[PDB]
Design a protein around this ligand. Structure first.
Ligand SMILES: C(#Cc1ccccc1)CN1CCCCC1
Length: 284
């Protein structure tokens, strides 16, 4: 039996290495990573790889790894796939812990925009979880944390983290992680997967996919939101992605909103993440 070496970037930035038989389905590797992580609530998570076009793709657990990575390296990342709208309802603290690590990266990367005060509050809960109670000894007026808190660090933000960290004395890691998630879950881009597209008139928009439904970001004004109940069906053809929307009750016919994606692959990728998120919605 011939086995391929797999390298997986974990949410703490460490690398897990294992082998799978070369015709292995994605689930085989995913099970090995989750066992390494002591993770039972596996449904929220997945592995990504980078394609020949360098786009992040989800590794489909039901398909051969080799028919997805194709010409590319067997290099993957471990990631949150379905962000729980209410993380307090997860059964295990360790689930919440990996969700916090993912969200920290969402924040530092700028995928999850955040006010100054929310960056400092989230950062203060991370410090409480990682270092425990505030200690003046490892913190003068000139202190800068090793922790990455934001896409752009300022001394003002470092000071605000320390100020809020002082208020969390006696908080356990599980408690701090739960506070982190109660704040993060409210942010308007929490759990939103963004895709570049053009509307039917050729104007550049972003489509967001999340637990609640689909968002069309025309700009900061003119955000269109379709709760999953309103979304009839979703399809792709060539470079095109089509959303059918239920009529208002007493209306005869659904509406169709069409979008142009960069290429056929970007259209199929959006379709798949939409179908996967809708099935998530129906199981809540
Ligand atoms: C959204 C949405 C949405 C809301 C209504 C219809 C379609 C999409 C994103 N938001 C993140 C914070 C928690 C609530 C869900």
């Amino acid at each position: 039996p011939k086995s391929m070496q797999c390298k997986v970037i974990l949410l703490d930035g460490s690398e897990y290495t294992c082998d799978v038989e070369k015709r292995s389905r994605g689930q085989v590797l995913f099970d090995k990573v989750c066992e390494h992580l002591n993770l039972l609530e596996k449904d929220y998570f997945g592995l990504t790889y980078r394609d020949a076009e360098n786009q992040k793709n989800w590794l489909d657990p039901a398909k051969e790894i080799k028919k997805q990575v194709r010409s590319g390296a067997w290099h993957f990342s471990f990631n949150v796939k379905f962000y729980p709208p209410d993380p307090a309802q997860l059964s295990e603290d360790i689930t919440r812990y990996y969700l916090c690590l993912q969200l920290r990266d969402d924040i530092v990367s700028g995928r999850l925009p955040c006010s100054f005060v929310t960056l400092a509050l989230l950062g203060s809960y991370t410090v409480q979880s990682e270092l425990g109670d505030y200690d003046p000894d490892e913190c003068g007026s000139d202190y800068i944390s090793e922790f990455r808190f934001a896409p752009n660090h300022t001394k003002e933000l470092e000071d605000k983290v320390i100020e809020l960290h002082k208020s969390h004395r006696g908080m356990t890691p599980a408690e701090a992680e739960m506070h982190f998630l109660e704040n993060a879950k409210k942010l308007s881009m929490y759990g939103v997967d963004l895709h570049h597209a053009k509307d039917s008139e050729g104007v550049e928009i972003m489509l967001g996919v999340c637990a609640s439904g689909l968002l069309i970001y025309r700009d900061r004004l003119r955000i269109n939101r379709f709760a999953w109940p309103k979304v009839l069906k979703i399809s792709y053809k060539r470079n095109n992605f089509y959303i059918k929307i239920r009529p208002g009750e007493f209306e005869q016919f659904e509406s169709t909103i069409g979008f142009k994606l960069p290429n056929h692959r970007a259209a199929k990728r959006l379709w798949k993440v939409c179908v996967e998120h809708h099935t998530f919605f129906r199981l809540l």
